[PDB]
Amino acid sequence: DIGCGTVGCKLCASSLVPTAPIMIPDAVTILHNMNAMEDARIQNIVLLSTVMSEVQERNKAIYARLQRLVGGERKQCYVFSNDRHEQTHCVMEETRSDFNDRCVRVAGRWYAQHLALAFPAVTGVAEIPSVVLVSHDKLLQSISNLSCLTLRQFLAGCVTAGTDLLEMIL
């Protein structure tokens, strides 16, 4: 009963678009960059229920701000119940950090493989959708459409891609 939240997905037939990278931030990213999360320039966010629980656990004020973004219904973000979904549900030798790292990695791997099947590549037109785990940790131990970057790296890559596109038109 748990969908991916992506618009036009026939597998799950929603706020996410497959035409932009699917951002999956960990709790540390939200806690350290809540002002950025709230900014209109940051769109296409997957809020994992485990990540939400971790944000609620660490910061009261940050969680209320995160709930407001969801309750506002004007942002391109989706709450994915990774703890209820059969293919992503993890049960905790693991520390609280290692378990939370595994949760995000498992949900990210599911999203990447799922979106590649739901929106397959159209020859010379478009590639499969891109999934980005937004973390300071090397979640993918330091799937082609799955990556792990910090928010700074992700945003610097956006600037590089935009500059390259502007040079192409000029």
Residues in the chain: 170
Q: Which is nearer to Mn ion, 39 or 57 (CB)?
A: 57
Contacts of 10 (CB under 8 A, 6+ apart): 118
Give dist(CA 128, CA 154) in Å, integer.
18
- Of 2, 15, 32, 36, the one binding Zn ion (CB under 5 A) is 32
Site for Zn ion in 41-100 (CB under 5 A): none
- Of 100, 106, 133, 151, the one binding Mn ion (CB under 5 A) is 100
Q: Is the Cα dihedral 162, 167, 168, 170 positive or negative?
A: positive
Can you read off the two tokens belonging to residue 112? Answer: 């990447």
- What is the smallest separation between the CB atom of 119 and Zn ion, expressed in angstroms? 9
Task: Give the DSSP H/E element, type plus range, for residue 146.
Answer: strand 146-149
- 39 annotated as belonging to a binding site for a ligand: no
146 binds, among Mn ion, Zn ion, Cl ion, none (CB under 5 to 8 A by kind): Cl ion
- The site for Zn ion (CB under 5 A) is made up of 4, 9, 11-12, 29, 32, 118
